[PDB]
Amino acid sequence: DPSRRAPTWSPEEEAHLRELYLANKDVEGQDVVEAILAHLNTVPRTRKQIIHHLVQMGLADSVKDFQRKGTHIVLWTGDQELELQRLFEEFRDSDDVLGHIMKNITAKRSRARIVDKLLALGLVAERRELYKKRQKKLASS
Numbered sequence: 001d002p003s004r005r006a007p008t009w010s011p012e013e014e015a016h017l018r019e020l021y022l023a024n025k026d027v028e029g030q031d032v033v034e035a036i037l038a039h040l041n042t043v044p045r046t047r048k049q050i051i052h053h054l055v056q057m058g059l060a061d062s063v064k065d066f067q068r069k070g071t072h073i074v075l076w077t078g079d080q081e082l083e084l085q086r087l088f089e090e091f092r093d094s095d096d097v098l099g100h101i102m103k104n105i106t107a108k109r110s111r112a113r114i115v116d117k118l119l120a121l122g123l124v125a126e127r128r129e130l131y132k133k134r135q136k137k138l139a140s141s
Contacts, residue, residue: 115130
């Protein structure tokens, strides 16, 4: 796809991905991501894609280290997202849904970790919606 998270790669191309990473990791205090991202105009792929394949090939540490605010992110799988997804909307009409989310859950997560993931799923538009009273109205703040 045109200019999104598109894979067009090969064992050689990702060796070229590490190629650029290994070459531009030597410079200090620089944006290593953009160095890679911008120099291999072989494949149309988003910023996430350089980070993705590098930490996935085990030659990089984490998404955190690359360019963004540290997210320890608890390994979010489809089933695990479903825990949060269902419980959130099932106790959304409560005095504190996240309170229930931790008590009635399988995975012990953090408040900040949960609220970020709600926004990512599009379960809410902000943090206040999940900290409201027992309302029963279309929750779109």
